[PDB]
DNA sequence: CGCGCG
DNA sequence: CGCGCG
């Protein structure tokens, strides 16, 4: 499922960065990189998160 | 597979019509329901395209 | 190697 | 009912 705290730590983890890969946000939060990755990829939809066009590396719009 | 020429088809749909529902585009491109929202939704991780928070209806940022 | 998938 | 899933 969807856990919108889930979604806040990983927005202000982003917000401390410029652009980061979902290991080392799972790693900074201590959460395992497939709920990471659930989470950024549905953030994405509608535009919370976006990640790079290449590269699995995430930012904040 | 993700075809960008599907992509840039798709794009231009958004670009006549904002707000759009999957089944109409892929009425007017001749294509499958699953085949334009597998675009849709590959579009949205990089913000070509934009998903409405609460409904399937897609937006041209 | 991109993986998020229920 | 959101479904995109390979």
């Known amino acids: ?3 919108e ?3 806040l730590k990983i ?6 960065k410029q652009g980061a ?4 946000i799972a790693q ?3 959460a395992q990189r497939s709920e990471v990755n659930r989470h ?3 953030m994405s939809e509608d535009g ?3 990640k790079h ?6 930012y904040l719009p």
């Open 11 to 16: 927005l202000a983890y982003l917000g401390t």
């Open 40 to 42: 950024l990829y549905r």
């Open 53 to 58: 066009p290449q590269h699995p590396v995430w």
């Open 5 to 7: 705290e889930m979604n």
């Open 21 to 24: 890969k979902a290991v080392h």
């Open 28 to 30: 900074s939060l201590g």
């Open 48 to 50: 919370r998160v976006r």
């Open 1 to 3: 499922p969807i856990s």
